[PDB]
Structure 1
Amino acid sequence: CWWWERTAGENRARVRVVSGPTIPVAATEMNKVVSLVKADTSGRQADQVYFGPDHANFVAVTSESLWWVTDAGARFGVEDSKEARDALGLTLTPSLAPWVALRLLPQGPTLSRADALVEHDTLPMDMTPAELVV
């Protein structure tokens, strides 16, 4: 595993490499990894996601861009403007994250007030879904 580590205000993050018999999660937590659907067959998207202790939901990346990550493993872009922030909450300052990792999560539509203001009678169907097995 490649590892990126940073403390708020430091000019540079620490990059390291780890190896072992299994992914670095305790055996008591091993059973709650999430398995994504992965509709993109190219090597540009992850297969699994895990949220450990002291994770971060609201994140910013290197002009900067703001993203919101859901527990289901999806990421959504959030507008920088006062309207969008004030309406959702998100007034606190976001944590930093590296783009080489964050890009691996699937992307949803951006939460902009200007496009929420729509009406529909019926919604479009989703092509290429995956089976729910009991």
Structure 2
Amino acid sequence: CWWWERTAGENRARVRVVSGPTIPVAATEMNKVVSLVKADTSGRQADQVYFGPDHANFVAVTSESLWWVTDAGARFGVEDSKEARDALGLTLTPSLAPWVALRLLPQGPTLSRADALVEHDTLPMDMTPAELVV
């Protein structure tokens, strides 16, 4: 594993490498890793996602861009404007994260008030889905 670590306000993050017999999660928590659908067959997307203790939901990246990550492992972009912030909440300051990791999660549409104001009779169907096995 490549590891990136940073404390708020520090001038630079620490980059390290770890290795071992198993992914760095306790055996008691090993059963709650999420397995993504992965519609993109190219090497540009992850297979699994895990949220450990003291994780971060609201994140900012290097002009800056704001992103919101769901427990299901999907990421959504948020407008920088006062309206979008005040309407969702998200007034607190976001934590920092590296683009080389954050880009590996699947992306949804941005949460802009300008495009939520629409009506529909029926919605489009989703191509290339995956089987839910019981």
CA-CA distance at 1:23 after TM superposition: 0.1
Q: How does 1:2-13 map to 2 (within 5 A)?
A: 2-13=2-13
The Cα of 1:39 is off from its aligned counterpart by 0.2
SS of the residue 1:100 aligns to: helix
Count of residues in Structure 1 that have an aligned counterpart in Structure 2:
134
1:32 shift after superposition: 0.1
Scaled by the length of structure 2, what TM-score is found? 1.00
Aligned-residue offset at 1:64: 0.3
TM-superposed deviation, 1:36:
0.0
After the TM superposition, which segments of 4 or more aligned residues of structure 1 sit over 6 Å from their partners?
A: none
SS in 2 for 1:76: strand
Q: CA deviation at 1:10?
A: 0.3
**Pairwise CA distance, 1:25:** 0.1
Distance 2:71 2:33 in 1: 11
Find the aligned partners of 1:33 and 1:46 in 2 and give their Cα distance.
13
Whole-angstrom distance in 2 between the partners of 1:81 and 1:24: 38
After TM superposition, give the deviation of residue 44 of structure 1 in Å: 0.1
Cα separation, 1, equivalents of 2:11 and 2:110: 30
CA offset at residue 6 of structure 1?
A: 0.1
Q: TM-score, normalised by structure 1?
A: 1.00
Deviations 1:93-128 (A, max 9, x none): 000000000000000000000000000000000000
1:129 offset after TM fit, Å? 0.1
- Structure 1 unaligned regions, length at least 5: none
Aligned-residue offset at 1:29:
0.1
Matched residues, percent identical?
Answer: 100
**Structure 2 residue ranges without an equivalent (≥5):** none
